[PDB]
Design a protein around this ligand. Structure first.
Ligand SMILES: [Mg+2]
Ligand SMILES: [Mg+2]
Ligand SMILES: [Mg+2]
Ligand SMILES: [Mg+2]
Lengths: 139, 102, 184, 65, 119, 143, 71
RNA sequence: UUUCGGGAAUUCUUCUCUGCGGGAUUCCUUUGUAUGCACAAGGUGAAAUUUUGGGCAACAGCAGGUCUGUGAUGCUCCUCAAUGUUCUGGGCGACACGCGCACUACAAUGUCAGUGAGAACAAGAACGAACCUACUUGAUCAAAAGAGUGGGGAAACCCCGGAAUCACAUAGACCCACUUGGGACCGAGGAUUGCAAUUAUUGGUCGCGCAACGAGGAAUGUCUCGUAGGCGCAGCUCAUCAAACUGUGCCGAUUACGUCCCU
């Protein structure tokens, strides 16, 4: 068989995002076409499917490290910001888009509000991630 | 029964080892089950400042340090029995606290 | 079931040799998989003569403030460079680079002991100088240019191995050796 | 360009100490002239015994010390 | 492939725009349109951002000029615009193509006439 | 039917790798849960794979090796991992084989690299006041 | 250095890409950019097509570097 | 067969924590010795020459600095419309100029948009709360910021401390141009700290970018191994603000291992 973490991270993320787009029941918010992924960026995302890729990356990031919140995920998706004539510093990503991503995955039935504090995968979400991993291995 | 945790803290390494040793000898004399002693990580407080009282000359600094030592001991005894073990002439500069765990 | 290593799992170290008899003890042809080794090669005086030659090339690409300390990037540039060298010459790329190192430095120089006075060049200095001049010539050729660094470095190396004057290193070697003859 | 073998290092010379004086043996052939010949030269880089040299002209000699 | 109507300079809002550039990066040559704004104009006009500006047609130019003139009619939010509550008129608008320079001269004359510190 | 298991460690700068080697049904080497063929970049993967190819893969025939690495950075963690794997094979052969085969593996590792089995003692030098780094003094101006 | 490199690949230079570029040894986006006087962006797109139709063979690939040769 | 729970149950100290100990001595071999004191190369080894890096450091002096650290001080000056003290406002921040020390760059060994893996030193509040933080809410639609439950006397919470250089077989965009390089200067909304933000707070959004700058004359600073250089992170100052300082880790070289030409 196969499971997540036995396959390449990018190929899993790319395959899952393509799955979300084709099934067509995901609830993309309207602000995804207007906003930047974080205030540490300078331009808007250049991939028109950037929201599906972010949702798939969030799902993989909850499979590892269950019980994670929006603040924890914002460290994973942060970057270094260009202040003009001053030195650079690290900024965490905006948590608003991460809040939308978890809400979308909850409406699909893949994420649960977690036991004590954070976010968690459901049994359906765990089944989805491993079946996708086997498809990637088969190619 | 209950479990009593003893915490020993001091500024001087020698006195903290002296106090912990006698607390262990008397506990074994009274035939009590013991956990530890545990040497917790030692912390150092640093302060660095200019040596000159004014602003003249080459800028030189001196750094002062201060070390804190900590040990803990766990006992299985009632409160009255523990007090006899704890009571003796402890050296100056050593703090000993008593707690009951859950 | 051990087998001998090949660089980037592709290029063979078997039969590697230099035709310059005077440099045979200062160019190391030891087999390895990748340039990275993370050793203490500057502890003694001549210990650096046992560092494998392709890694010495990689250490010559981490030069300016933007390039200092980037060894993994230098390894990737060399991997692409060797493939282009093989296409251009149809020979073993490892043999081509040791030929270039054997020719890229002047055998006679003039120093300021005497005006100037002509002296001979130690074999250790000949291999140090060949690597330095070949990397410097390729870095300047790619500064504001459509050509990539791998393409610029490949041309410099194949020209040096042929003794062609189109190489940066060969051109400077002809000037230093000509001036030294004047100050004999 | 003949080849010579360094058999002795006669100290470091010149102002600033970047030149070394050595004596070298012209290996050459086995029966031909310039065989077992010795000569004293100045060398620019770092060198030690048993190093080999490439000599463009084997006719000049270096002044001692 | 090259079309017969490829133009090396396209005239848009009294500005000469270089036709060799990608569409969003040729539209930022208009005063009042930045890189963030130019991408949004292409989205509301239904233009692929991977084309070159020299292939744009006459009907495509009129649409782009109309979006830039009134971005709020095409559902571009107010926080995106460069003059949100005009100190004289109170209306939210976007300024472009030499209205940027005229309004700048108006603002400095406003501060000098009342003799404020900034003006 | 007993458990044949050993544990070793390796260190480079601040990274510490701990390897558990156990006899199993099929060979399997993982680092922090990731199989070796998934490790990136290829340069660092070939560095770790040296602990296998130097002696040969026939000596890892039915061994399951799991490596946990913490501390350090991208490159020092790769170097600590390969040291833990090489030392793990020696420790396993010392416990469940005789001395002739172990000594034959040990000198092959040492003939290739000393740091495959012995840790590098280098550490960062402390910073001093009046200097920007360990050794760089402040800029001096005369006029 | 005017360097008037075209960005849109007219029909005359399309023939040259499909006819003689395959006959070259050591194809690279920068190498045929100046032989045909076209921008590197459309040179790399034109070479990606020939790799799909199996007219040239890929030799070394990376996220930023690609070098081909003849069949 | 693998994988998951920051189920449960036994037993155990490889990794972590630390008070006192061990360990290196030119110890062993061979050179030249110059037969004494020693040296060079190798061996042993975690480490091989002051093991590495710091702290401490004699005697004599300087009319060096500090009377803006003190309830350390002689002499002298002011002392009720005070040179004492407090309160209001302004200034210490003014500028077509000169000099020292920094920060950001001039691009393709790059900029932008994604995705991966992955440190160390630290800090946290005075009848409960004034300090630091996680989580979810705000959200049937922007950043950042309102707000609500909790936790932490700090190996216990933050925290499995998801740092930035870095990597990517990402089939992504740009193509040698003052250009998607650079980001100075300025315009218009809005929020936050504070008793008070204009003469001077600080984040965030759209615009300006048409301001120089395409590698820098004579001169000149620092540096020999986990070093230089590059990269971020803590502490300090602190209600609010770090292009500084004091520390910490990460990536990681070229060259010499010499001399008395200059100082
Ligand atoms: Mg930058
Ligand atoms: Mg100074
Ligand atoms: Mg511009
Ligand atoms: Mg000048």
């Amino acid at each position: 068989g196969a499971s997540l973490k036995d396959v390449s991270a990018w190929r899993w993320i790319k395959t899952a995002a393509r799955h979300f787009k084709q099934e067509g029941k995901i609830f993309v918010p309207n602000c995804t076409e207007i906003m930047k992924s974080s205030h540490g960026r300078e331009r808007a995302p250049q991939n028109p499917d950037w929201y599906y890729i972010r949702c798939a990356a969030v799902l993989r990031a909850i499979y590892l490290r269950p019980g994670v919140g929006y603040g924890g995920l914002s460290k994973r998706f942060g970057n270094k910001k260009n202040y003009g004539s001053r030195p650079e510093h690290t900024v965490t990503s905006s948590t608003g888009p991460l809040h939308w991503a978890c809400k979308s995955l909850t409406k699909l039935g893949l994420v649960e509000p977690g036991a004590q504090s954070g976010q968690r995968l459901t049994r359906k979400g765990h089944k989805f991630a491993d079946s996708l991993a086997f498809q990637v291995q088969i190619r | 029964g209950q479990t009593v945790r003893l915490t020993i803290t001091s500024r001087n390494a020698k006195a903290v080892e002296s106090v912990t040793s006698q607390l262990l000898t008397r506990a074994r004399d009274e035939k009590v089950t013991i956990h530890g002693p545990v040497r917790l990580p030692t912390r150092t407080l640093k302060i660095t400042t200019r040596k000159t009282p004014c602003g003249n000359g080459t800028n030189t600094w001196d750094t002062f340090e201060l070390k804190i030592y900590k040990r803990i001991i766990d006992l299985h005894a009632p409160t009255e029995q523990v007090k006899k073990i704890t009571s003796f002439t402890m050296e100056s500069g050593v703090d000993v606290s008593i707690t009951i765990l859950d | 079931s051990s087998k001998t290593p090949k660089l980037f799992n592709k290029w063979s170290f078997e039969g590697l040799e230099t035709s310059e008899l005077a440099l045979r003890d200062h160019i190391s042809t030891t087999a390895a998989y990748v340039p990275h080794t993370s050793g203490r090669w500057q502890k003694r005086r001549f210990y650096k003569a046992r560092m494998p030659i392709v890694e010495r090339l990689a250490n010559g690409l981490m030069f300016k403030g933007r390039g200092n300390g980037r060894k993994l990037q230098a390894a990737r540039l060399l991997k692409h460079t060797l493939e282009i060298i093989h296409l251009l010459t149809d020979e073993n790329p490892l043999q081509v680079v040791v030929d270039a190192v054997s020719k890229g430095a002047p055998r006679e120089d003039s120093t300021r002991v005497g005006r100037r006075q002509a002296v001979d060049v130690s074999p250790m200095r000949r291999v140090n100088e060949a690597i330095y001049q070949m990397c410097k010539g390729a870095r300047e050729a790619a500064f504001r240019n459509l050509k990539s660094m791998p393409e610029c470095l490949a041309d410099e190396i194949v020209n040096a191995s042929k003794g062609s004057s189109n190489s940066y290193a060969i051109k400077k070697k002809d000037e230093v050796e000509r001036v030294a003859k004047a100050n004999r | 360009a003949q080849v010579g073998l360094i058999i002795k290092v006669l100290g470091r010379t010149g102002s600033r100490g970047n030149v070394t004086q050595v004596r070298v043996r012209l290996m050459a052939e086995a029966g031909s002239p310039d065989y077992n010949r010795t000569i004293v030269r100045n060398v620019k880089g770092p060198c030690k015994e048993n190093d080999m040299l490439s000599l463009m002209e084997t006719e000049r000699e270096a002044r001692r010390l | 492939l090259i079309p017969d109507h490829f133009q090396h300079i396209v005239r848009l809002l009294n500005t000469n725009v270089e036709g060799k550039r990608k569409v969003p990066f040729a539209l930022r040559m208009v005063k009042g349109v930045g890189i963030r704004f130019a991408y949004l104009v292409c989205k509301k006009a239904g233009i692929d951002v991977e084309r070159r500006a020299g292939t744009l047609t006459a009907e495509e130019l009129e649409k782009i000029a109309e979006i830039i003139a009134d971005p709020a009619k095409f559902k571009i939010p107010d926080w995106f615009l460069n003059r949100q509550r005009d100190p004289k008129t109170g209306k939210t608008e976007h300024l472009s193509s030499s209205m940027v320079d005229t309004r700048l001269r108006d603002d400095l004359e406003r501060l000098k006439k009342m003799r404020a510190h900034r003006g | 039917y007993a458990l044949k298991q050993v544990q070793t460690f390796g260190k480079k700068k601040t990274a510490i790798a701990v390897a558990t080697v156990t006899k199993a049904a099929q060979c399997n080497i993982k680092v922090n849960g990731v199989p070796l063929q998934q490790i990136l970049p290829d340069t660092l993967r070939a560095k770790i794979m040296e602990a296998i190819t130097v002696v040969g893969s026939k000596y890892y025939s039915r061994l399951r090796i799991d490596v946990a690495v913490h501390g350090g950075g991208q490159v020092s963690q790769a170097y600590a991992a390969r040291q833990a794997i090489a030392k793990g094979l020696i420790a396993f052969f010392q416990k469940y084989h005789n001395e002739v085969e172990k000594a034959a593996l040990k000198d092959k590792f040492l003939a290739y690299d000393k740091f495959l089995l012995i840790a590098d003692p280098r550490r960062c030098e402390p910073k001093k006041w009046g200097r920007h780094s360990a050794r760089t003094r402040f800029t001096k101006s005369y006029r | 250095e005017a360097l008037q490199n075209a960005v849109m690949f007219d029909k005359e230079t399309y023939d040259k890409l499909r006819s003689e570029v395959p006959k070259y040894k050591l194809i690279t986006p920068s190498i045929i950019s100046d032989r045909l006087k076209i921008a590197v962006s459309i040179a790399a797109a034109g070479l990606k097509q020939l790799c799909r139709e199996k007219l040239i063979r890929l030799v070394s690939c990376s996220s930023k570097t690609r070098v081909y040769t003849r069949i």
